[PDB]
Design a protein around this ligand. Structure first.
Ligand SMILES: [Zn+2]
Ligand SMILES: [Zn+2]
Ligand SMILES: [Zn+2]
Ligand SMILES: [Zn+2]
Ligand SMILES: [Zn+2]
Ligand SMILES: [Zn+2]
Ligand SMILES: [Zn+2]
Ligand SMILES: [Zn+2]
Ligand SMILES: [Zn+2]
Lengths: 258, 258, 258, 258
């Protein structure tokens, strides 16, 4: 069912891209669909069809004008080759799926920016998509640290896209910080820290409304309590606590830099 | 059920405006909803609430920047006063409904132009909306020549909106000519001229694809056959033939002027 | 009795405006009285009379020269429409009552500034008015965080009015900081923290006398004790504690920025 | 046998390209052969091999310098993807075969222009190849209107190629007009109008000999008789008559514009 899940994910993202953007950007739907096909090819054997499809999507990125997507696609090409030589298949499909998500998200984000919708919608959209992708990659079997690295790459591509569309920098920082707080809350919820997740999401809501100062104050309070809890456990803690610590630190840094 | 139909029409148009344009254009949803309210007030008694709502909608049109919509709103204000004094209610609500449709169609057309969708979509959207409004006005009881006059006013407002959005003039002419051919086919279908309607719609299809020359040739052939049929009946013909003749003449003139 | 309370509140504020400013500012008494009428109309059914009265009051604000009041009145217009469509009535009247209080307080504050009364009087007047309005909104049923948001909107309008009257910026900051300390003390008193409220009011008294440094020292001491008490309860606390924490943080920031 | 027919068509066109042009134009023989393989791949399953081969041929067109062929190959690529996703196979191979014929005919026409052969040979060659392709596409199952659209695309590419080779514009118009009259005669012959086709081909013979005026006069006479026959049938006529009408109109327009 895994390859069916990858196909469904790619097709749903392409349909949403077409619905939001119409026929103005049909290329992005083709990129999403071919990257879904390359991913399922990698999951079902093969190593050369994946290379060819990734090169095709790289050519489309070259002609359309997507720069960050093109760079990410070259990186997917080289890595996917290396890990397919090494015999590991899940991680190559993981890189391809992250590439497809980057393409869909850049399409939808540029659509939202062109027709002037508020930044809350872009931020919530990207955060929810990242959480869904993280759930999928957890289902496949990729290790968590690689998951977070892929998600940060996707966020970087989306931020570059929003920069090219003229969105002011503080709004881009708000988008990224919202994504980081959502990811941190998602990680914290699995281990059974519900109150922590609610406080983090309250801080996120105060951030998306433009109340930066109350967001920073509530974020620093919840981070202080969390960090005391971390130092309680000494030289032992589940890895998701360790990753959430860095996610929360980066979120705080971004909010302070707004 | 008539007032319920007017309410449903206004709310559906407002919901579509919001879906296509999002939160970027909330004012237009309010204008559509208040114009629907003024129309249903006029249909259910009253003469002062309609005045107040139309004045409020005129104020919104003034602040947003809609020029043609504001002019049409002043015009419906004055006329609605006159006919409400004369005791005729259906035609005042007809003017108000035409105003609401003009506002909604202007919003959706500006949304389509902002995100760069093809002109076939705008043309087909506007033409189908005009046909639906014509069916509604036929249900209420307005005489047909007033129906066509209101529909042409709506088309004029939409063309002005598309002009302000930078759409090139030939595309505006294509939009209007497609609207006229659709209206003419709709009128011809009721009296039982199916083949004529199919040929008119074939010519319209060739027009929307950019094949102007084949569209003009096929339009002139079908017009010649139709006009011979009209001259067959001498000094007698159902009134819809007489209206469709002028619709077809204007459609041909617009196509030639592209 | 609720609509009677709203009527009494509006008439009392209008009478006080007339007593303080005389016949110099008659428009503001009319704005207060019509905003009270729109609020009681909203509380007693209706959705169009409220629209008309708010539009009339906006016209008065436009002609008189009130800028911040006009902006807030447009915002009241749009929101009142939205929530009246959604069927919620208390919050629309809450926005209208906040607008009436902003108009009355702007009038009285400009009167006080014109005849050169000390800033302690403006600060104490505004703070007590905000406390009375908060009690009223608690009686109606508005949730507390909406209460605080409306009160901050009122404070923003009052600060803009005082800025247009030439009052120096540090006095405006003193007014706002006194208002926040009064609101925080009011919130803390309900939950049974008397000593905290007395110390906050002592710090406020030292602030209004011009002793900024002793006010900041005593405020930081009481804030440190309060915040230790907050962190004692971990991930649980009555919601008014959470709101008072942000109120105190903003009050301290404003005092430091004087 | 259909895939064998496509292979035979492609190889025969490639051999003719090589015989006419020698080793000077070897790239075009390879492009024709690869488009033959891509078409037969599409007819025998597959969707990714067709993608790859069309991209390879696009690269060849990029390096050689064929511009219009490159544009048509990009269009072929995008459409072939869409219709292969929709599951329709005959039309994608039809687009590929049209592309191969455009490439081969471009090569042969440039060869004829380089060694200075008269324009009658180019016109007759192109017209006969178009008739053969239309016969093949009729054998496959493509609808006739798509057949005519593909044939016009082939003619447009050929005209662009001849323009790039410095052939004067009136000779290009002669080529296209001869092609349209040949196509109209071919369509008319199936319905069983032998006299009409004979007179059209007499007009074509007079046109290719440089006698433009007698060509236009005889063409207008046969067109007048044909159009009277069309108007005889009213609102009913086989589709081939309708297509021939537009073909004849375009031929007359081109001859008049010489
Ligand atoms: Zn490679
Ligand atoms: Zn740490
Ligand atoms: Zn009036
Ligand atoms: Zn006529
Ligand atoms: Zn209003
Ligand atoms: Zn101390
Ligand atoms: Zn705190
Ligand atoms: Zn491709
Ligand atoms: Zn004709």
């Amino acid at each position: 069912t895994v390859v069916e899940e990858v196909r469904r994910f790619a097709e749903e993202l392409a349909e949403e891209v077409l619905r939001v953007g119409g026929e103005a950007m049909r290329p992005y739907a083709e990129m999403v669909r071919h990257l879904g096909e390359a991913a399922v090819a990698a999951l079902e054997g093969r190593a050369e069809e994946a290379d060819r499809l990734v090169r095709d999507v790289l050519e489309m990125a070259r002609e359309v004008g997507a720069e960050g997507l093109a760079r990410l696609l070259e990186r997917v090409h080289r890595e996917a080759r290396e890990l397919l030589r090494e015999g590991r298949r899940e991680e190559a499909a993981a890189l391809v799926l992250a590439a497809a998500l980057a393409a869909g998200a850049v399409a939808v984000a540029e659509a939202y920016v062109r027709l002037g919708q508020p930044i809350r919608l872009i931020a919530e959209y990207v955060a929810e998509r990242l959480v869904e992708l993280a759930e999928l990659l957890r289902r496949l079997g990729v290790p968590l640290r690689r998951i977070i690295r892929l998600l940060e790459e996707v966020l970087r591509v989306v931020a570059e896209a929003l920069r090219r569309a003229g969105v002011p920098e503080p709004e881009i920082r708000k988008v990224e910080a919202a994504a980081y707080i959502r990811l941190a809350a998602y990680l914290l919820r699995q281990l059974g820290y519900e109150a922590l997740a609610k406080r983090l999401l309250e801080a996120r809501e105060l951030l998306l409304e433009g109340r930066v100062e109350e967001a920073a104050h509530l974020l620093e309070d919840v981070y202080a309590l969390f960090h005391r809890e971390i130092e309680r456990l000494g030289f032992e803690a589940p890895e998701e606590l360790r990753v959430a610590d860095l996610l929360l630190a980066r979120a705080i840094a971004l909010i302070k830099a707004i």
